[PDB]
Amino acid sequence: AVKKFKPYTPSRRFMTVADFSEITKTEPEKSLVKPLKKTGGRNNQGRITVRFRGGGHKRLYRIIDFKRWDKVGIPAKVAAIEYDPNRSARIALLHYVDGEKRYIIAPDGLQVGQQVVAGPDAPIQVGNALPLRFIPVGTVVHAVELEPKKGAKLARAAGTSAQIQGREGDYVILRLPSGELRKVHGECYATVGAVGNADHKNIVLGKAGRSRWLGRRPHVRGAAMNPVDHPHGGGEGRAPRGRPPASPWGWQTKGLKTRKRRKPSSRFIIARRKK
Amino acid sequence: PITKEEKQKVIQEFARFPGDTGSTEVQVALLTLRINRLSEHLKVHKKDHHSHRGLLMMVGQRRRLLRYLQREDPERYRALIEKLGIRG
RNA sequence: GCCGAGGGUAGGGCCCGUGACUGGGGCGAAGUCGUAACAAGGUAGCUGUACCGGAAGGUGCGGCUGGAU
RNA sequence: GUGGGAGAGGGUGGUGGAAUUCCCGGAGUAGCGGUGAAAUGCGCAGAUACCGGGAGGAACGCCGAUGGCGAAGGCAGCCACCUGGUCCACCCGUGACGCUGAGGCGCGAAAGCGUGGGGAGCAAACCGGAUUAGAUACCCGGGUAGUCCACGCCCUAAACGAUGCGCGCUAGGUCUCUGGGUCUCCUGGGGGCCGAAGCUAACGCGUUAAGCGCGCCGCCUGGGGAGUACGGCCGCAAGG
């Protein structure tokens, strides 16, 4: 669901908020949080190197388990579902029967009070983790690793899912969230199901201030600048671009491909994306 | 569905005299039974418009008897709809 | 002293007359353009809707026979 | 009530194969495609035609019927669950509890709209080729909404049987679907055809009345202007 407001202020009229119904615990688990070093988009030189960043809400970072092959065969109960400010997706607090506690990103359908497990033998049900080779071809999956033991890299954002297409030797064939068709190694762990909070994309920020809370400062158009600042700078009155639309740094910005052609992972991408 | 057994209890708890099936009492009670189930069926299957007509007919059906029953013995009317929890 | 005809201030409601200009409508006709309908009317017709075209109209979708053979 | 029946009736969730398209491997060569005839188009940068692999979407061939179901719109592979109407036999229960229905409320083909998916085929708009006096068309090659899914809107129709619902009475023949019997046939309930009496301006209707009658409702009052204007209510808009 998504919550609307009555138009009692001009900005409320459009603003929509998340429904937060799946949340059962309004406090992060202390032994799993640590402080987020805000950067402002500035690097170790101090330079802005990603423009327009800063001034958002303070955040405590939740330590997530992107391995899971860490604890094969030890089951865990789903103790709660929590809000995580560092992602789109929601999180799930697991209490292992081991006694150890961990977070994973919360799949859609997960129940508070159910059980999950990881390993070659896990039942193919929501929340379990297996090497890709043992998940049946055709079932949809998330939190997928890209190389074995390297951590879950793909399908991590709310509502996303990858899907297994077929197999070819040591490798399985995934259709990624973007529609790209890729070979991933069969020993790459993955978690059955899709990520939850799929209603995320229907959120209407509603006013300038909301973006500000998110730590996103205002973006200024090239066309509004001067030639020193930007290719689109200057001109008397408004002006069309007057050259191929360009970035602040001059490269072409409508259409121009930038993936390195000789990149070694090319042997593994079957079909570049779509749409 | 409703089962034979499940239905008899209703027939048995509302019968006016030992052998009774289908007196106004039992009639309404039997109807209240299928109604309340269909209501729950439509609660999930919101797009089953055809079976809603059924419901509206039954709701209509039970309504006309209650008017009959309320007309002949008021004391008995309020008695049946209390045991069935019906007015609104 | 109250009420009080009415006068005055302010804001509302219904109606009537009228208005540069504008929308289609009726009639007039000895005008221009095409030929959509009535025969299978020369792409069967009509239809609600949608998009389009100088104009009758066309085409998509679904519907009707009030369609020749 | 008890006991049975037939059915594409409705909702949810799955799942099967035929075919079209695209992609991949093979093998193969100079054309393929299309029309009235053609051109556009595609093709030696290897098409068509053929074999194997794969991806995805939509619609269900034969059965299929002058058939079945639904109040209407409408509903067709198959599987399970949930659910509605309806017929039959027994003559067991209630005892006129009935009929209709201004407002109201719900349902309501297609197209259309909103947010999000999906997009193989088809295809308004649009482009190109032909035809032609012209061709903003008919024919051919392309092609976007949309057609599909979810939720929410719109509420219109040649939404038709151009025939409001219920009840009773008034010859029969025949074909068919579906219950029940004493299974030639008898009896119910639906679907067609021809016909008694009667009705009708005629065409035609005729136990599925458009016949003879009662009840209640909706509707008509010369053609156009006009389903327009104004007012009013509804809708995001279209517009009702």
Added chain:
RNA sequence: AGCUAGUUGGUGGGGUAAUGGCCCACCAAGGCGACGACGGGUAGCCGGUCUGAGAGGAUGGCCGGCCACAGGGGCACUGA
């Protein structure tokens, strides 16, 4: 298509030949409406007249009855 604050009723008084929210004070939350309230338009109503086979339709001048008005409004005085 909804209307109503003297509004609807009660009590106490004022007022008249006399009842009455007719008028005033207080008290209660009521009164009217699809059997068409409220609003807009039009008209004085009837005996009758005209037409019509009747049912009905149209009408209300003259004449008789009642009402309303007396330049437009408001008010009282004298008085059975």
Added chain:
RNA sequence: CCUAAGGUAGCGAAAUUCCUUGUCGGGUAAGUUCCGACCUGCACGAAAAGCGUAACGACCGGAGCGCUGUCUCGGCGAGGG
């Protein structure tokens, strides 16, 4: 005849109209501005977005009531110079 193709809806004397105080209408006793129209748009036009839009504005136009030393048209008075 020419083109790769010849501006669609909507809007238009406009923050855009040169001729220009275009023409007509409204408002005024009188209106180069303002509002409503017309269209031969010098030189609008569809995300350098097009046409609208309730609310908002120390933005920029036009009008009216109220009230005033803004003005007719100036006068006197106070205080600091």
Added chain:
RNA sequence: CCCUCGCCAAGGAACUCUGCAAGUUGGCCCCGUAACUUCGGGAGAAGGGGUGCUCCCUGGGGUGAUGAGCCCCGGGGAGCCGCAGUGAACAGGCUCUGGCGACUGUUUACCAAAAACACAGCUCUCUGCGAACUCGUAAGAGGAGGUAUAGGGAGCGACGCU
């Protein structure tokens, strides 16, 4: 003569590029309030009545104790005075109608606050993650302890119909 201020007969914007400036209005309580509308608003729209003091009668609340006292919020009646009762001080002038920008915001420190910038929102496009992109010769960093419902770049700028 100047500045700051006070008042002014009759007129009342005739001033001027412009009502510039200055009048007016001004708090609370009560009555009342239009087009249009995204149904919130427009709205303090507008317009108007009240406002001091004295006496008599009475209602609820707090702290007490359930009462006195103290404090809070009222109601009704009859009277007094002045030109005048938010008697001083602080305290909106209003309305109709176009353009531009949806809106709150931001800006040329010190001649421009705007119609400019930003803005939610729309679209195109890049990026499979040792991402693209950015800074750095490099190492290392940001991106991001994020992962296509995510991140960069660009144009447009609520919303409606396009």
Added chain:
RNA sequence: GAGCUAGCCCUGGCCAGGGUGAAGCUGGGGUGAGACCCAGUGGAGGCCCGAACCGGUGGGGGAUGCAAACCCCUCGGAUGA
């Protein structure tokens, strides 16, 4: 050279008083169940009025200034970007 200024990072602090009255919740109505309507409760918001605080709209003065940007009147924001 970032003791001015601009952005960010870490850690503290501040915003009188009044007004409007979102969702939610409770009760009542409505219905087959609903949608929903009403009342109370409630206290939302780049909400409203206005001090501090942050500004700098118009006008006047100042102009070898009180001041190398000030003064007066007026005006914008004031729980938020």
